[PDB]
């Protein structure tokens, strides 16, 4: 690139205008993007905005790891374990059994054990197009209760089949994250308590540190009135 | 640098699933010195990533952004630390203000006296902690210190 743009926020208004393009000229914006992208990169599904994005595990009806039947497509009536979701598109990438496309790929992105440039790759698919399985497929799932998961380490909801709430579709237990990194502090030290609220006389963090912690010349923090000030103000 | 590498590969980097930024609650029960050390470690990590990120963007013209994401995450932890530092000071100030109101302080002292002091079924240890907590008396001189001494004398007389 030879840019330097990344070390600053210059031409901010222009960037905002470009970034927040009007939605009725979104086809115009993306037409040229589509053209630019090669076949193996580009996706058919609409790149949804971060507002309308499934952040919660309730908003996603399915998690990476669970088993799902595909429908409304070429590879329909096919069971598939969903591998990973795409965040920008609001869609899932399924395993080998799911929907795919055969596309030419350059030798930069060649897998070990390839004869041809042609490679089959999995297309993204929406949560609307595929239904759960348990063999019995599920029409729709609803969430009514919640609980702390041991493996996920989150207060996740209970996936219950729509109609009869007692038939729980359980979450897929994820793979064990064997953490061995120098930049992650271990559980014992991460949580060990070294502070206690003890003193009322001595303040906990020093007076010379305050200017870093908060702006002493803050225009927002208005001063309170006094009697003398009132008297000065009023005729 | 990190392990004397011109650039951390994808394998050399810490993966996203294994890594988490600090929680504000977790930070809240850490000492000042510890928090300060953590902050400087974060800053060091950012510098390492910033060097690398710059190289990636300026020279090779990449859009891989793992380094950038890491830097952002570190920045998040830093502001959370900054927030908890401010919050602690504010809490202290509020406590001071509360103590300054005389009746409330008197009530608090009475409550302290009733439950744990002057009771049976340790006391000295409580007093030494209480001394430090409420007055300027460790093991230098002020009106507050004098008041604490008087209170201690009163407690001794009672007991």
């Amino acid at each position: 690139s030879g840019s330097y743009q990344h070390l600053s926020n210059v031409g901010s208004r222009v960037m905002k205008r470009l970034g927040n393009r009007p939605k009725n000229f979104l086809p115009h914006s993306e037409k040229f993007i589509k053209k630019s992208t090669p076949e193996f990169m580009k996706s058919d599904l609409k790149e949804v905005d971060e507002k309308t994005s499934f952040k919660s595990e309730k908003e996603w009806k399915f998690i990476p790891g669970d088993r799902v039947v595909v429908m409304s497509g070429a590879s329909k009536g096919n069971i598939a374990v969903i591998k990973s979701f795409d965040k920008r598109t609001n869609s899932f990438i399924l395993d080998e059994n799911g929907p795919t496309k055969t596309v030419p790929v350059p030798k930069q992105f060649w897998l070990e054990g390839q004869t041809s440039h042609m490679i089959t790759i999995p297309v993204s698919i929406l949560g609307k197009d595929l239904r759960l399985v348990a063999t019995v497929a599920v029409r729709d799932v609803s969430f009514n209760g919640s609980y702390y998961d041991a493996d996920y380490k989150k207060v996740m909801p209970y996936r219950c089949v729509k109609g009869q709430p007692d038939l729980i579709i359980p979450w897929p237990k994820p793979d064990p994250i064997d953490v061995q990194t120098n930049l992650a502090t271990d559980p014992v030290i991460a949580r060990e308590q070294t502070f206690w609220v003890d003193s009322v006389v001595r303040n906990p963090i020093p007076k010379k540190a305050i200017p870093s912690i908060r702006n002493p010349h803050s225009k927002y923090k208005r001063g309170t009135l006094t009697a003398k000030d009132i008297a000065k103000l009023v005729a | 640098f990190s392990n004397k590498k011109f650039i951390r590969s994808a394998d050399d980097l810490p993966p996203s699933s294994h890594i988490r930024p600090w929680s504000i609650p977790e930070l809240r029960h850490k000492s000042f010195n510890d928090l300060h050390s953590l902050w400087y470690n974060c800053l060091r990590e950012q510098n390492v990533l910033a060097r690398e990120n710059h190289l990636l963007k300026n020279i090779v013209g990449s859009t891989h952004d793992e380094f950038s994401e890491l830097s952002n995450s570190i920045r998040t932890t830093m502001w959370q630390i900054r927030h908890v530092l401010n919050e602690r000071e504010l809490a202290y100030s509020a406590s001071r203000e509360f103590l300054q109101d005389e009746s409330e302080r008197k009530k608090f002292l009475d409550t302290l006296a009733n439950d744990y002091f002057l009771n049976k079924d340790e006391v000295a240890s409580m007093l030494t902690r209480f001394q430090l907590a409420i007055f300027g008396i460790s093991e230098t001189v002020d009106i507050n210190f004098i008041d604490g001494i008087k209170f201690l004398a009163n407690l001794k007389l009672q007991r």
């Binding site: 193996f40 990169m41 996706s43 591998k83 990973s84 795409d86 598109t89 869609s91 990438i93 992105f109 897998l111 070990e112 790759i121 999995p122 993204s124 | 994808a10 394998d11």
Partner: peptide
């Protein structure tokens, strides 16, 4: 999406 898939494939190959 493709890039992420490719990365996953590489990881699988490695392990």
């Amino acid at each position: 999406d493709f890039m992420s898939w490719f990365k996953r494939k590489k990881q699988e190959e490695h392990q």
